[PDB]
Write a protein that binds this ligand. Structure first.
Ligand SMILES: *Cc1cc2c(cc1C)nc1c(=O)[nH]c(=O)nc-1n2C[C@H](O)[C@H](O)[C@H](O)COP(=O)(O)OP(=O)(O)OC[C@H]1O[C@@H](n2cnc3c(N)ncnc32)[C@H](O)[C@@H]1O
Ligand SMILES: O=C([O-])c1ccc[nH]1
Ligand SMILES: [Cl-]
Length: 385
């Protein structure tokens, strides 16, 4: 005989943040997760995540990125877990041949963000360890950096539970039963009811949203990252090697400086295997592209960090057709909030989204402008059953 004010299905990056925001307000919340967050089955492991402010995916994300940054600073002061390191983020690519680089620069200009603009040999000179052609240009953002994503979720969870939130782990939600005055979920461990529901199952939204009469194109992608033994005198966070996201002819790559000798971490963002979250192979190296795509980049742009592979991780992106998020109320149920399709670039915003989700669930509205994340926008090609 236990109901709840709000139920969060999927206590990961977005869900746990929401749980923390709700618990802080004394809202009796229940968070249900198929596993035990943080874990290595979803989209939040791999240890680190980049947070950028000058948004190359679109300047409309800036306000949320800035609020998220402030919230990350708040979390740092609230927990013993490490949350953020200001490595700065470097963005580069061939001059005049990168929409990403261009939009990043424009976003920086339009929002009066503090950035450094350099090109060619200036890049190589400032950051020994980086070798780009003379025709390359870049924009460096000194105030953005790296988030320790697993620590973020763990901190949010510990804070939320301490304030009353309940977390039901290793419990997969299998169905939903929504009424105008309440919401109900069904699991093998029991059924639960509340006044409001927040759906944030990550990669699994592409399989379970149909249970909510929603037909939205969502494609999960297998994305790997590798840690490589590197020249610490050049790639360590200690010597200010920055986090980065760059565009080269074959696509977009991202990386992190070596922290305490863990080695430089690199990822190839443009490519990934289309998969099912329930049958995805989470072993690094099973596909020759896993390690080959990464070394091809390192050999050309960061030769000193192309050493032995120290560690590998397999994680998932969940893309929408326009690659913009989905944060909105269910079109037929104002008491249901949806957080989906973060298309590989949503963790940095998770703190902000947690606040947005909490507001939508409790009031049906949010102070933040989330118009570009509308669940009813045509660019999504959504529908119902
Ligand atoms: C994969 C990846 C993503 C990524 C990245 C590097 C890699 C390799 N680097 C990033 C970066 O530098 N900066 C950034 O802003 N984003 C970056 N990303 C993307 C980001 O990690 C993802 O967008 C984010 O983690 C998405 O969060 P979301 O909360 O959607 O996904 P989750 O953390 O996986 O949580 C979902 C949870 O729900 C649970 N679940 C699933 N099914 C069920 C059912 N049936 N019942 C109950 N719970 C369920 C999962 O267990 C999971 O915990
Ligand atoms: O959003 C990002 O900064 C990012 C890096 C890799 C995937 N997403
Ligand atoms: Cl994602």
């Amino acid at each position: 005989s236990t109901h709840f004010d709000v139920i969060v299905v999927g206590a990961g990056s977005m869900g746990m943040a929401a749980g923390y925001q709700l618990a802080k307000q004394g809202v009796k919340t229940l968070l249900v997760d198929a596993f035990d967050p943080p874990h290595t089955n979803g989209s939040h492991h791999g240890d680190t995540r980049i947070i950028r402010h000058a948004y190359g995916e679109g300047r409309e994300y800036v306000p949320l990125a800035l609020r998220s940054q402030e919230l990350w600073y708040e979390l740092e002061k609230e927990t013993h877990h490490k949350i953020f390191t200001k490595t700065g983020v470097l963005v580069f690519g061939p001059k005049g041949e990168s929409a990403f680089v261009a939009e990043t620069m424009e976003a920086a200009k339009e929002h009066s963000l503090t950035v450094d603009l350099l090109e060619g040999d200036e890049i190589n000179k400032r950051w020994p360890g980086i070798t780009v052609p003379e025709n390359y240009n870049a924009i460096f953002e000194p105030n953005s950096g790296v988030l320790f994503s697993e620590n973020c979720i763990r901190a949010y969870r510990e804070l939320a539970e301490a304030r009353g939130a309940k977390v039901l782990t290793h419990t997969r939600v299998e169905d939903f039963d929504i009424s105008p005055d309440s919401v109900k979920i069904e699991t093998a461990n029991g059924s639960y009811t509340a006044d409001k529901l927040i759906v944030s199952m990550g990669a699994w939204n592409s399989k379970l949203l149909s249970k909510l009469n929603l037909d939205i194109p969502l494609q999960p992608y297998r994305q790997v990252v590798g840690f490589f033994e590197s020249d610490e005198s050049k790639y360590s966070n200690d010597i200010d090697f920055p986090g980065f996201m760059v565009e080269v002819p074959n696509g977009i790559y991202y990386g992190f400086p070596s922290f305490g000798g863990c080695g430089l971490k690199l990822g190839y963002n443009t490519f990934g295997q289309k998969i099912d979250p329930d049958t995805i192979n989470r072993e690094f190296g099973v596909y020759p592209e896993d390690e080959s795509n990464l070394r091809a980049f390192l050999e050309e742009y960061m030769p000193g960090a192309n050493g032995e592979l120290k560690r590998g991780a397999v994680c998932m992106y969940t893309k929408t057709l326009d690659e913009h998020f989905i944060i909105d109320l269910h079109p037929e149920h104002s008491n249901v909030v949806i957080a989906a399709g973060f298309s590989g670039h949503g963790f940095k915003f998770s703190s902000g989204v947690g606040e947005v989700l909490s507001q939508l669930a409790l009031t049906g509205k949010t102070e933040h402008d989330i118009s570009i994340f509308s669940i009813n926008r045509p660019a999504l090609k959504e529908s119902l059953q």
